[PDB]
C-alpha cells in the first residue's frame, strides 16, 4: 500500500537497518589483484545537451586493503556521486566498493595475477522502498492516462531494493580445506617471482557484532 | 479480476549459465555446426545481474536538509564478452552436390562467385510477351530490386570479427582450455 495523495511535509528522513549479500572468495597472485569501479568523467561540452547527465567511466585500479566489497548496490564511487550522503548504509558513504574483473586478468598473456580463484554469492530482496526527490527524466506522457483531484501530483518513482542475505550453512563454506595447485590456469604454474605472493580473501559469513 | 505479482528467488553462483565453456559434438539438427553465409546469431537473456545503481545531483548546498535541493537520476549498466574457436572445413564441389545446395538456397552458390544460373531450363507456355510499349491494356510492370539482404530492416548489436582472428591458440583463455580437452 502506498496511498494517494501524499501525506508528509518538508523532510521525512528515516532510520533503518539492513544487511548484505554473502560473498566468499579467494585469490592467489604474484602481482596484486586488480579491480574496477564506476566513476565520473568529463563530458562533451560543445554540444547543447538537453539534460546534462554526468557521464560514467570505467577505471581499472589496484585493490588496496580496507576497501569495501560490493554490497548489492553496484560497483560505483559513492563518495562523489551520492551528494546527499544519506542513501546507502553508513560504512559505504564515503568510499568506493570495488569488484574484481576476472575476464581481464585471464586475458593478460603473462597471467601473473591468478593461480586459483573461487567465489560464491547469493542474494534476494526482502523489502521495497522508494527514494525521495525529483526525477531527472520524468515519465513521458503516452504510457499512462492522467486523472484529477487526489491524483494531482505524480509520485516520484525512484525505486530501490534492499539486499537481504540468506541462510548460511556450514556445508557451503570455503575455508579450512586445502587446495593443491595441480595446474594453474594461466602460464605461471605456481612460480612466485620477486619472492612475494598476494593472497586475498573477502568473507562475510563470520561478521558478528 | 485477479492478478498475482511474481518475484523470483535467491540467485546463487552455482545456478549460472555463463562464464563456462560449451563444446559441441552433435547438434540437434542436421546442421552439424556449419554456418553458411559467414555469420552467426547468438542471443542471451539474463535477469540475475540486473542491478540499478541510482545517482544524486544537488542544487544548492548547506548543512540543513531540504528534499528539493537534490535531483536524482536512474541508470543501469550491462556489459558482455564473446569468445569463439573455429575450424576450417572444405567442400568438394561436384555435379551431384550443387544440385542439392541449389534447392536449399540461391544466395550460397552465388557468393562463391564462380558462375551464374539460368533459373528455368525453359518453360512451356507462351507467357504472352508484348513489345508495343504500353498503351492498350495495363499490366503490372513489376520492376525488381534484390535489396542485397532480407535482414536490413531489423536492428542488432553488430559486432565485427574481420580483424580479430588468430592462428596460435594458447595465447588466449579458450585455447588453453580447449587444448587440455583434446590432448594435443
Amino acid at each position, epitope marked *: 500500500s502506498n496511498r494517494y495523495p501524499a501525506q508528509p511535509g518538508s523532510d521525512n528522513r528515516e532510520c533503518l537497518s539492513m544487511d548484505y549479500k554473502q560473498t566468499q572468495l579467494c585469490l592467489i597472485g604474484c602481482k596484486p589483484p586488480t579491480g574496477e569501479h564506476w566513476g565520473k568523467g568529463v563530458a562533451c561540452n560543445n554540444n*547543447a545537451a*538537453a*539534460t*546534462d547527465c554526468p557521464p560514467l567511466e570505467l577505471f581499472n585500479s589496484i585493490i588496496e586493503d580496507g576497501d569495501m566489497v560490493d554490497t548489492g548496490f553496484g560497483c560505483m564511487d559513492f563518495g562523489t556521486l551520492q551528494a546527499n550522503k544519506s542513501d546507502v548504509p553508513i560504512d559505504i558513504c564515503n568510499s568506493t566498493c570495488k569488484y574484481p574483473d576476472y575476464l581481464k586478468m585471464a586475458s593478460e598473456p603473462y597471467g601473473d595475477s591468478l593461480f586459483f580463484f573461487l567465489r560464491r554469492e547469493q542474494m534476494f530482496v526482502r523489502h521495497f522502498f522508494n527514494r525521495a526527490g525529483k526525477l531527472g*527524466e*520524468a515519465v513521458p506522457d503516452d504510457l499512462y492516462i492522467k486523472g484529477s483531484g487526489n491524483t*494531482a*501530483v505524480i509520485q516520484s518513482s525512484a525505486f530501490f531494493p534492499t539486499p537481504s542475505g540468506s541462510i548460511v550453512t556450514s556445508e557451503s563454506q570455503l575455508f579450512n580445506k586445502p587446495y593443491w595447485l595441480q595446474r594453474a590456469q594461466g602460464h605461471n604454474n605456481g612460480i612466485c617471482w620477486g619472492n612475494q605472493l598476494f593472497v586475498t580473501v573477502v568473507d562475510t559469513t563470520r561478521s558478528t557484532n | 479480476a485477479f492478478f498475482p505479482t511474481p518475484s523470483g528467488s535467491i540467485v546463487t553462483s552455482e545456478s549460472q549459465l555463463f562464464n563456462k565453456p560449451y563444446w559441441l559434438q552433435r547438434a540437434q539438427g542436421h546442421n552439424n555446426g556449419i554456418c553458411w553465409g559467414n555469420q552467426l546469431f547468438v542471443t542471451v537473456v539474463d535477469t540475475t545481474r540486473s542491478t540499478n545503481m541510482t545517482l544524486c545531483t544537488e542544487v544548492t*548546498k548547506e548543512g540543513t536538509y531540504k528534499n*528539493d535541493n537534490f535531483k536524482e537520476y536512474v541508470r543501469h549498466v550491462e556489459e558482455y564478452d564473446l569468445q569463439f574457436v573455429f575450424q576450417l572445413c572444405k567442400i568438394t564441389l561436384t555435379a551431384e552436390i550443387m544440385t542439392y545446395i541449389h534447392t536449399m538456397d540461391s544466395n550460397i552458390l552465388e557468393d562463391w562467385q564462380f558462375g551464374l544460373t539460368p533459373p528455368p531450363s525453359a518453360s512451356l507456355q507462351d507467357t504472352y510477351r508484348f513489345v508495343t510499349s504500353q498503351a492498350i491494356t495495363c499490366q503490372k510492370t513489376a520492376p525488381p530490386k534484390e535489396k542485397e539482404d532480407p535482414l536490413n530492416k531489423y536492428t542488432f548489436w553488430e559486432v565485427n570479427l574481420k580483424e580479430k582472428f588468430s592462428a596460435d591458440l594458447d595465447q588466449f583463455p579458450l585455447g588453453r582450455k580447449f587444448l587440455l580437452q583434446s590432448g594435443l
Partner: antibody, heavy 119, light 108 residues
Framework: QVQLLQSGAELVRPGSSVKISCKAS????????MHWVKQRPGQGLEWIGQ????????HYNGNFRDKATLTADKSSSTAYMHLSSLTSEDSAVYFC????????????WGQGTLVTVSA | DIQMTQSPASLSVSVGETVTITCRAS??????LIWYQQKQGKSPQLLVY???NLADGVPSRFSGSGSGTQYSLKINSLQSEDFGSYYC?????????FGAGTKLEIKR
C-alpha cells in the same frame, strides 16, 4: 540550441493583473527548476521564487507571498508568473531563470520585461 | 535572509589597471558566489562560478579570491570589453539575494 524568449515591453494599469510568460526550448523542460527575478530600477535584483514543471511544486518569497501565483504549463513549454493587484513599486524589469543541470547559478536568461502602471 | 554589501558604487578606471570590487555578507557562505557582467541595453552573462571556477569562453584576466565572509574578484589589464554594470551573487538561502551593483566607468 537552448533559448529563452521573452516579450520585452508590457503596459498595464495599477490594481489589475498581468500574465507574464517566457518560452523554453533546446532542453527538456521537466528536468529543471525555474526561477523568476526582479531588478528594481536603481537597485539590484530580487529573487522571487522557484518552480518545477514536472510536479508543480511551488516556492515563493515571503515578501512576495500572495503577491505572485507561480503556475506553469507543460504542453506549450512555458512558465508563468501572475502578479495580483499590481502597484507602482513593482514597476521594474523581469527575467525567468535557467541554470545548468547542476544548478549553481543562472547560465542562460531571457530578454527582459519592463512593466509600467498608468491610466 | 543574508543581505549582501557590494562596494563601491562605481569606479573610474582606464585600460591596464588592477581592479577589485568588495563583496561582503552576514553569514559564512562557503565560496558559493557568482559574479556577473551587464552592459547597457543587454542581459547578464556568466563569468565565474563557485568563486574560483570560470565558465567557458572567458579570458584569464578574471580571477576569484577569498574565503569566509568576504570575497573579491581580480582583473589585470582590464580591457574595453569589460566595461559595464556588475553583480556578485551568493546562492545559499531562503531567499537568495544579489549584489548592490557597480557600474564600471571610464577614467578621464
Amino acid at each position: 540550441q537552448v533559448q529563452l524568449l521573452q516579450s520585452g515591453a508590457e503596459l498595464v494599469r495599477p490594481g489589475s493583473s498581468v500574465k507574464i510568460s517566457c518560452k523554453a526550448s533546446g532542453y527538456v523542460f521537466t528536468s529543471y527548476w525555474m526561477h523568476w527575478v526582479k531588478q528594481r530600477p536603481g537597485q539590484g535584483l530580487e529573487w522571487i521564487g522557484q518552480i518545477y514543471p514536472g510536479d508543480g511544486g511551488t516556492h515563493y518569497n515571503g515578501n512576495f507571498r500572495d503577491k505572485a501565483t507561480l503556475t506553469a504549463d507543460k504542453s506549450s513549454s512555458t512558465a508563468y508568473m501572475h502578479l495580483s493587484s499590481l502597484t507602482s513599486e513593482d514597476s521594474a524589469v523581469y527575467f525567468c531563470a535557467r541554470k545548468i543541470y547542476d544548478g549553481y547559478g543562472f547560465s542562460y536568461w531571457g530578454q527582459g520585461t519592463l512593466v509600467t502602471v498608468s491610466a | 535572509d543574508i543581505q549582501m554589501t557590494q562596494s563601491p558604487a562605481s569606479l573610474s578606471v582606464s585600460v591596464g589597471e588592477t581592479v577589485t570590487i568588495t563583496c561582503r555578507a552576514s553569514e559564512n557562505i562557503y565560496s558559493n558566489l557568482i559574479w556577473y557582467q551587464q552592459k547597457q541595453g543587454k542581459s547578464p552573462q556568466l563569468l565565474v562560478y563557485a568563486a574560483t571556477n570560470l565558465a567557458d569562453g572567458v579570458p584569464s584576466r578574471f580571477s576569484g579570491s577569498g574565503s569566509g565572509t568576504q570575497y573579491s574578484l581580480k582583473i589585470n589589464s582590464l580591457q574595453s570589453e569589460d566595461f559595464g554594470s556588475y553583480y556578485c551573487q551568493h546562492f545559499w538561502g531562503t531567499p537568495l539575494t544579489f549584489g548592490a551593483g557597480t557600474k564600471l566607468e571610464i577614467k578621464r
